[PDB]
Amino acid sequence: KGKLPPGPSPLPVLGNLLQMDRKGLLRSFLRLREKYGDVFTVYLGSRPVVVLCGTDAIREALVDQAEAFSGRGKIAVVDPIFQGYGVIFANGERWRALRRFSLATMRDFGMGKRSVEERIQEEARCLVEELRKSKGALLDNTLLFHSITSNIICSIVFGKRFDYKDPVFLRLLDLFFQSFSLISSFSSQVFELFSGFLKYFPGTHRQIYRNLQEINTFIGQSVEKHRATLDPSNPRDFIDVYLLRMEKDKSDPSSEFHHQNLILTVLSLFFAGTETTSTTLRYGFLLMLKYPHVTERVQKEIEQVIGSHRPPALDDRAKMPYTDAVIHEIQRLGDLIPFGVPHTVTKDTQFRGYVIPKNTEVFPVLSSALHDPRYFETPNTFNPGHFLDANGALKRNEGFMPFSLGKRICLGEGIARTELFLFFTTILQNFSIASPVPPEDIDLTPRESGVGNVPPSYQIRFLARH
Ligand code: HEM
Numbered sequence: 001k002g003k004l005p006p007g008p009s010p011l012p013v014l015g016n017l018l019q020m021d022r023k024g025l026l027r028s029f030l031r032l033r034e035k036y037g038d039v040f041t042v043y044l045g046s047r048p049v050v051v052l053c054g055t056d057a058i059r060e061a062l063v064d065q066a067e068a069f070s071g072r073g074k075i076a077v078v079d080p081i082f083q084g085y086g087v088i089f090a091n092g093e094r095w096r097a098l099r100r101f102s103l104a105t106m107r108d109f110g111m112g113k114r115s116v117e118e119r120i121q122e123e124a125r126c127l128v129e130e131l132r133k134s135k136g137a138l139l140d141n142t143l144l145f146h147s148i149t150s151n152i153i154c155s156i157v158f159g160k161r162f163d164y165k166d167p168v169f170l171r172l173l174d175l176f177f178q179s180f181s182l183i184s185s186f187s188s189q190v191f192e193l194f195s196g197f198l199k200y201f202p203g204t205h206r207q208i209y210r211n212l213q214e215i216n217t218f219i220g221q222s223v224e225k226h227r228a229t230l231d232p233s234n235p236r237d238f239i240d241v242y243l244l245r246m247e248k249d250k251s252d253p254s255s256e257f258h259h260q261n262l263i264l265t266v267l268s269l270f271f272a273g274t275e276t277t278s279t280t281l282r283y284g285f286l287l288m289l290k291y292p293h294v295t296e297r298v299q300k301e302i303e304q305v306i307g308s309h310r311p312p313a314l315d316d317r318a319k320m321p322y323t324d325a326v327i328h329e330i331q332r333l334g335d336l337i338p339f340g341v342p343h344t345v346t347k348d349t350q351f352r353g354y355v356i357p358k359n360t361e362v363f364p365v366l367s368s369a370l371h372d373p374r375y376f377e378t379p380n381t382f383n384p385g386h387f388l389d390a391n392g393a394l395k396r397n398e399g400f401m402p403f404s405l406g407k408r409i410c411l412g413e414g415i416a417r418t419e420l421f422l423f424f425t426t427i428l429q430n431f432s433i434a435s436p437v438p439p440e441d442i443d444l445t446p447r448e449s450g451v452g453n454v455p456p457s458y459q460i461r462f463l464a465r466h
Pocket residue numbers: 072087088089099153268269272273274276277280336337340341342402403404405407408409410411412413415416
């Protein structure tokens with residue numbers, strides 16, 4: 001008997017509830033770290049979970065024993081929708097199949113087809129056009145940022161984008177993004193522990209269910225359109241490539257590529273692909289308002305590398321160390337997925353002298369890496385310095401794992417990072433920014449903190465440069 005990692009003694013049913021913290025799952029995990037260290041077991045309701053804190057511990061599991069920890073566990077409030085299908089929430093061979101398909105696909109588009117950077121560039125331009133019309137007025141960029149991000153996923157997945165005032169677009173927008181806030185509510189974190197009981201009563205889970213059903217409905221009726229226009233020689237977008245692939249194995253009643261796996265993979269792409277990018281952007285700008293000198297510097301460097309004429313492109317990034325550092329530091333401080341996304345182990349496992357039984361849920365707490373004082377002088381202060389060596393060159397940092405690590409690492413890292421780079425720079429190229437609020441009175445504490453973090457809403461003006 002090697003046994004489970006150390007941790008508090010559970011009650012039946014309640015589990016470790018009486019050891020948790022009212023402030024949420026994260027604060028709980030961090031309190032428990034102080035007592036039990038970087039690898040402990042906490043019983044969430046009746047199911048035990050292994051929490052990993054610190055960079056070292058996270059890395060040993062995810063990179064070193066990469067495969068043992070290649071498993072994905074459920075999120076209670078969304079499991080009824082996903083049910084183990086789609087790229088995010090699938091395991092074993094299904095997941096292996098989907099993720100291989102999902103990379104390849106967005107990974108090229110082809111010799112005539114337009115590319116993801118091209119798409120993002122276009123979105124950026126459309127955005128700057130949109131931001132001009134407001135002629136320097138106070139706004140709340142929340143809806144715009146949700147818009148540009150969803151449009152990138154649409155562009156990829158439906159082969160079209162949507163005007164920022166498109167009303168039925170906006171209805172679905174609103175609906176879909178309300179889900180994110182419900183999902184990271186306190187209620188949803190209680191649901192995580194006790195769904196087995198709360199499933200019988202009204203609560204956020206039902207709302208989240210309806211909203212995701214509505215989008216699923218819309219996804220499905222766009223899958224139909226695509227199907228009756230399918231041109232097997234010029235696959236326009238994601239859905240097409242899938243549908244063609246669905247064809248191949250229509251002869252195999254054991255193939256993973258069917259209707260259900262399609263709808264939910266597309267959901268998955270919006271689900272994982274949209275809010276975090278958007279809130280990163282939103283938070284970037286909040287930060288640049290608190291730290292004008294950074295913004296100035298970012299602008300100075302855009303001036304030198306890109307100029308005022310042409311539009312930022314992706315390989316401008318390798319020539320813009322300070323800017324890449326600011327982005328990295330935005331994501332780091334941002335800390336938008338504090339306790340990561342549930343893994344499970346795929347086999348009994350030895351870890352630091354413990355044995356973890358098959359399918360036990362593992363929670364890699366990325367927040368504890370992003371704030372690791374070994375890798376970040378100043379872990380709780382904004383500081384592009386964390387990513388710049390003495391020669392103003394861009395230095396990798398072991399503590400920096402926002403997209404997580406290993407076999408499950410964010411499938412959209414590439415896209416995501418391009419979005420951040422191109423939107424940040426393209427906006428900053430054409431606009432100064434300002435706020436009623438004085439810099440040093442800009443509170444940066446997140447309004448809500450759950451499986452995602454939300455920065456405070458704030459008002460900003462985008463001023464002209466043209
Ligand atoms: C700020 C931007 C983003 C961040 C910080 C982010 C972060 C993450 C993180 C931390 C995970 C957990 C990986 C794990 O389980 O260990 C994840 C999973 C995932 N992300 Fe992202 N993501 C971002 C944007 C995107 C975009 C734009 C896409 C797709 C277009 C995307 C697609 C995915 C998918 C499909 C998964 C599930 C991976 C799997 O289970 O195989 N993400 N993401």
